[PDB]
Amino acid sequence: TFGSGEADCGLRPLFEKKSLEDKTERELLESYIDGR
Amino acid sequence: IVEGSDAEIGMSPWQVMLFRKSPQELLCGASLISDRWVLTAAHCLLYPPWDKNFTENDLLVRIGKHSRTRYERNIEKISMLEKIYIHPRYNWRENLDRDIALMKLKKPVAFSDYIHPVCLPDRETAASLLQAGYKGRVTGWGNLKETGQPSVLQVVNLPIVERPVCKDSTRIRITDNMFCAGYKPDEGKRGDACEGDSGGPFVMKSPFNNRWYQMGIVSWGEGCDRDGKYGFYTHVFRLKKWIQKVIDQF
Amino acid sequence: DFEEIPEEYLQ
Ligand SMILES: NC(=[NH2+])c1ccc2[nH]c(-c3ccccc3O)nc2c1
Ligand SMILES: [Ca+2]
Ligand code: NA
Ligand SMILES: [Zn+2]
Questions:
Q1: Residue of chain C nearest B26, judged by CA positions
Q2: In which family does this protein belong, per the annotation (chain C)?
Q3: Residues 6 or more apart from B13 whose CB is under 8 A from it?
Q4: Residues 6 or more apart from B220 whose CB is under 8 A from it?
Q5: In the CATH scheme, what is the homologous superfamily, with its name and number, of domain A1-36?
Q6: Which residues touch B116 (CB under 8 Å, ≥6 apart)?
């Protein structure tokens, strides 16, 4: 149940699910001092 | 959102719009956390100082939107509420401490490429991502300036600020149930949520499992994007036990 | 400035 949510939560059909990035998420991942 | 950009289609599929039936107007932002539960800020529903006390029957929840004023036929869903739960210790008298509320939808919503729930963080995710300097994203159809409104959903990414700085920017008492975000005067970046954005989500993207988690709820701020000030958000994880309780009890 | 929505959602 919560903890995460509906099991399938946080993944967007038009982005993550298709392996596509929105134009500013990289800004976020970079502030975590390299998210890969 | 001040100094934000237009969102892309399907960027924030959990973004919800609290709309009032009469007059028909945008009340607040909210987020889809399950197919039957929406999370928002309690001051959007109850704030006695200004005589605000909405009930199920005065609100509509619109999900899957992009455009602020148009009924996006075949794309958005409108749900009615079954129940509204305000946190029993929501402090409207002093600093909007525990500004959180849950709303149960009359019927479940079906997901689509435009409607999908956001995840709520667990102790480990809270710990590793809620660090000053990390950026989060806020979305809403709120004002564009302090003193106009946008045609579509706006987005802005703000860093979390160290708690000392947050306390040193206001006279208001900050509790451990709030965090603040925004840029310092000496950064050369602007941005903030603004009126009309209350209730919406502050989310972060986990670099471990690629999911978006909602760390905060837009709660308050003094003006919009003023230099020296920050925006405050309700700390979702600290209130998560209350969330779990009403969802597995109701 | 909000466009009307289907009567059925007011009730
Ligand atoms: N600057 C900000 N970070 C901010 C965020 C949400 C707000 N919500 C409001 C607000 C103002 C009047 C009535 C309701 C509100 O939620 N001001 C706000 C300011
Ligand atoms: Ca991984
Ligand atoms: Na500021
Ligand atoms: Zn899905």
A1: C2
A2: Belongs to the protease inhibitor I14 (hirudin) family.
A3: A12, A13, B32, B64, B111, B113, B114, B115, B116
A4: B43, B96, B99, B198, B231, B232
A5: Thrombin light chain domain (4.10.140.10)
A6: A8, A9, A11, A12, A13, B13, B14, B32
Q: What is the CATH number of the domain that holds B133?
A: 2.40.10.10
**B78: chain C residues, CB-CB within 8 Å:** 5-6, 9
**Ligand 1 lined by B138 (C-beta under 6 Å):** no
C7 close contact with B: CB closer than 8 A = no
Flag if B71 and C10 touch (Cβ within 8 Å): no
Rounded CA gap, B135 and B144, in Å? 20
Experimental determination approach used: X-ray
The B101-105 sheet, strands edge to edge? B77-79, B59-63, B15-20, B25-32, B37-40, B101-105, B81-86
E strands, B88-223, are 101-105, 135-140, 154-159, 178-181, 201-205, 212-221
B43 is catalytic: yes
Q: Which of B152, B150, B174 is nearest to B231 (CA)?
A: B174
Q: Which chains touch C (3 or more CB pairs under 8 A)?
A: B
How far is CA B192 from each of CA B2, B90, B232, rounded to the nearest angstrom?
A: 5, 23, 10
| Pair B110, B100 in one domain | yes
Is there a contact between B158 and B140 (Cβ–Cβ < 8 Å)?
Answer: no
Backbone angles phi, psi at B64, to 5 degrees: 95, 15
Nominal resolution in Å?
Answer: 1.6
Number of domains comprising chain B: 2
B55 and B44 fall within a common domain:
yes
Q: Which domain holds residue B172?
A: 1-12+118-237
Q: Which atom of ligand 1 is nearest to the CA of B223?
A: 1
Do both B80 and B27 map to the same domain?
yes
Same domain, B200 and B244: no
